[PDB]
Amino acid sequence: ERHTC
Amino acid sequence: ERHTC
Amino acid sequence: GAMGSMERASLIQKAKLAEQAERYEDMAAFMKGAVEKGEELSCEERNLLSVAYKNVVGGQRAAWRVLSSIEQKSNEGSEEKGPEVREYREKVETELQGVCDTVLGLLDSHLIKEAGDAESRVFYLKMKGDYYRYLAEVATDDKKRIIDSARSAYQEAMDISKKEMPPTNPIRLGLALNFSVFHYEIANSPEEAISLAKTTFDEAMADLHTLSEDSYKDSTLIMQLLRDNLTLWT
Amino acid sequence: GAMGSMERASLIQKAKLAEQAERYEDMAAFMKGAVEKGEELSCEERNLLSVAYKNVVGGQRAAWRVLSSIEQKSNEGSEEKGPEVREYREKVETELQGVCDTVLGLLDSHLIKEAGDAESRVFYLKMKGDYYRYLAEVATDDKKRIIDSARSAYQEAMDISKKEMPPTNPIRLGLALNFSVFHYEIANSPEEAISLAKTTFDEAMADLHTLSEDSYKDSTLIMQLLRDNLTLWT
Numbered sequence: 001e002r003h004t005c
Numbered sequence: 006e007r008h009t010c
Numbered sequence: 011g012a013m014g015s016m017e018r019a020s021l022i023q024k025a026k027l028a029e030q031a032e033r034y035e036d037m038a039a040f041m042k043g044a045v046e047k048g049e050e051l052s053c054e055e056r057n058l059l060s061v062a063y064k065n066v067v068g069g070q071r072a073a074w075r076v077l078s079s080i081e082q083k084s085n086e087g088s089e090e091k092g093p094e095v096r097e098y099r100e101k102v103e104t105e106l107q108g109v110c111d112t113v114l115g116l117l118d119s120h121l122i123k124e125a126g127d128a129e130s131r132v133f134y135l136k137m138k139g140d141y142y143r144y145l146a147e148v149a150t151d152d153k154k155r156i157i158d159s160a161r162s163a164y165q166e167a168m169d170i171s172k173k174e175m176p177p178t179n180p181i182r183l184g185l186a187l188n189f190s191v192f193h194y195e196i197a198n199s200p201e202e203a204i205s206l207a208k209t210t211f212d213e214a215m216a217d218l219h220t221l222s223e224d225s226y227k228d229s230t231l232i233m234q235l236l237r238d239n240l241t242l243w244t
Numbered sequence: 245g246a247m248g249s250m251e252r253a254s255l256i257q258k259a260k261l262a263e264q265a266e267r268y269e270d271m272a273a274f275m276k277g278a279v280e281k282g283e284e285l286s287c288e289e290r291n292l293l294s295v296a297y298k299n300v301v302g303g304q305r306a307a308w309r310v311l312s313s314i315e316q317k318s319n320e321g322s323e324e325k326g327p328e329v330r331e332y333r334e335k336v337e338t339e340l341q342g343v344c345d346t347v348l349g350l351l352d353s354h355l356i357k358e359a360g361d362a363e364s365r366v367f368y369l370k371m372k373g374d375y376y377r378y379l380a381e382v383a384t385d386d387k388k389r390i391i392d393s394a395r396s397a398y399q400e401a402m403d404i405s406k407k408e409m410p411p412t413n414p415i416r417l418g419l420a421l422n423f424s425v426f427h428y429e430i431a432n433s434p435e436e437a438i439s440l441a442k443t444t445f446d447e448a449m450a451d452l453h454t455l456s457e458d459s460y461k462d463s464t465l466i467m468q469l470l471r472d473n474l475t476l477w478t
């Protein structure tokens with residue numbers, strides 16, 4: 001669950 | 006929040 | 011139809027894939043295609059059909075309620091903002107009515123007419139009442155005739171289900187749940203809604219002793235849904 | 245275009261309504277229409293544009309990953325099920341590529357070319373890298389050129405953002421977050437990804453003392469997103 005925005 | 010199905 | 015060139019089995023396969031992917035618009039299009047092949051649906055296939063359109067129209071209804079609330083606030087001291095809110099509420103409403111019409115047309119051509127077993131006939135008549143009920147939620151010269159269509163469909167399903175199904179049957183219980191909410195918030199009959207939810211719950215409770223363990227997860231869920239509505243209304 | 249007859253202000257108004265209703269496909273169509281009026285977007289309008297398509301493509305990507313996982317399991321002892329899984333994965337993939345192409349076309353016609361201020365130019369170049377990155381996720385003769393397009397867009401945004409924005413600027417931080425994930429899972433460069441997330445976090449941390457209280461909720465969120473990725477990767 002790495003984050004991108 | 007009455008329920009229907 | 012766009013699905014006319016696809017095999018029936020492939021359509022069913024792809025509806026199940028769309029379910030796993032929560033792609034409910036696709037799921038509905040695949041099952042519509044499956045219905046239009048002209049063969050009766052199995053039990054598992056009926057459930058795919060109803061879940062697909064329940065989620066499509068459900069999202070449309072939630073968005074319609076958001077916009078309608080904004081529209082109502084704009085008609086209280088409120089600053090004129092123009093026609094955009096009404097326009098976009100109408101846009102969503104027309105799409106919603108279109109889906110409901112498509113589902114009612116599938117039932118009319120020709121699912122209900124070819125359903126002889128109670129489990130299918132009640133299932134489809136419940137669906138008919140549900141989607142007429144959804145049309146009633148947004149109706150304002152026509153509401154009365156749409157409401158009576160919903161009641162008539164529910165009532166016939168009720169009659170069949172009482173004669174031909176046990177009181178614990180999940181379809182019978184789910185029909186009673188939705189027909190009770192129909193009485194409560196559409197037909198302005200809260201006492202009929204409460205009475206219907208209580209006798210339905212009580213008569214299924216008395217029948218539980220006949221049932222195998224873990225073969226009625228859906229019925230037990232719906233009984234809790236009946237109990238929840240009663241607690242909310244009393 | 246279908247939105248060509250609607251006023252620019254009405255399109256913006258209706259995109260905000262679609263946001264409140266979580267009707268992101270509509271929101272994207274309204275903002276596409278707004279872009280096509282030919283005027284630059286304000287800051288608030290840029291955010292409406294990016295949120296709309298981020299949610300549309302996001303849902304398409306999640307469904308593509310579901311189907312691709314099923315497809316891969318079907319190519320391990322696995323029983324042949326036919327072409328349906330590949331077909332439906334391709335169907336979703338082609339739709340996804342279509343949205344990405346539409347967003348890249350808006351940026352190319354003519355958002356990037358008319359953006360002079362750093363806050364807009366970096367914002368649009370980040371978007372360009374994002375949607376080329378999404379094309380790279382599903383690419384298998386073409387992946388290399390799509391990957392380089394994404395990197396080139398990210399890199400130019402990086403250059404501008406370092407020269408023209410403070411280290412705490414939310415757009416600069418969000419660009420660095422996504423370019424780091426680009427390095428990690430697209431360009432096979434985990435060390436570059438880690439280094440980029442750490443220097444970005446550390447240099448914003450040193451700049452917090454210049455900032456007003458409660459004027460940087462978005463920057464603080466993104467700093468936690470950088471910290472989360474680092475903890476996951478180290």
Ligand SMILES: C=CC(C)(C)OC[C@H]1O[C@H](O[C@@H]2C3=C([C@H](C)COC(C)=O)C[C@H](O)[C@]3(C)/C=C3/[C@@H](COC)CC[C@H]3[C@@H](C)[C@H]2O)[C@H](O)[C@@H](OC(C)=O)[C@@H]1O
Binds near residue numbers: 060064
């Ligand atoms: C889309 C289909 C999938 C997800 C594969 O199955 C949906 C479900 O299909 C069946 O459940 C039906 C069913 C529902 C059950 C109450 C769900 O039960 C549990 C424990 O999750 C919800 C669904 O919407 C569905 C298909 C709808 C109806 C409803 C239809 O009116 C036209 C009447 C009541 C209810 C009946 C048909 C239920 O039997 C099964 O008995 C359920 O299995 C279990 C554990 O009870 C399964 O979850």
Ligand SMILES: C=CC(C)(C)OC[C@H]1O[C@H](O[C@@H]2C3=C([C@H](C)COC(C)=O)C[C@H](O)[C@]3(C)/C=C3/[C@@H](COC)CC[C@H]3[C@@H](C)[C@H]2O)[C@H](O)[C@@H](OC(C)=O)[C@@H]1O
Binds near residue numbers: 466
């Ligand atoms: C759809 C627009 C709405 C919901 C109205 O606003 C979205 C948000 O728009 C702004 O936040 C932007 C913004 C995000 C913020 C990190 C959200 O912050 C909080 C506290 O919720 C998420 C959004 O996706 C958005 C627009 C995207 C970008 C991203 C765009 O790349 C092309 C780069 C980083 C980030 C920047 C642009 C953020 O400034 C605002 O500063 C946010 O307000 C707060 C409390 O920080 C607001 O929640």
Ligand SMILES: [Mg+2]
Binds near residue numbers: 017018
């Ligand atoms: Mg055939």
Ligand SMILES: [Mg+2]
Binds near residue numbers: 050124125127
């Ligand atoms: Mg028959």
Ligand SMILES: [Mg+2]
Binds near residue numbers: 251
């Ligand atoms: Mg004008």
Ligand SMILES: [Mg+2]
Binds near residue numbers: 284358359360361
């Ligand atoms: Mg300019």
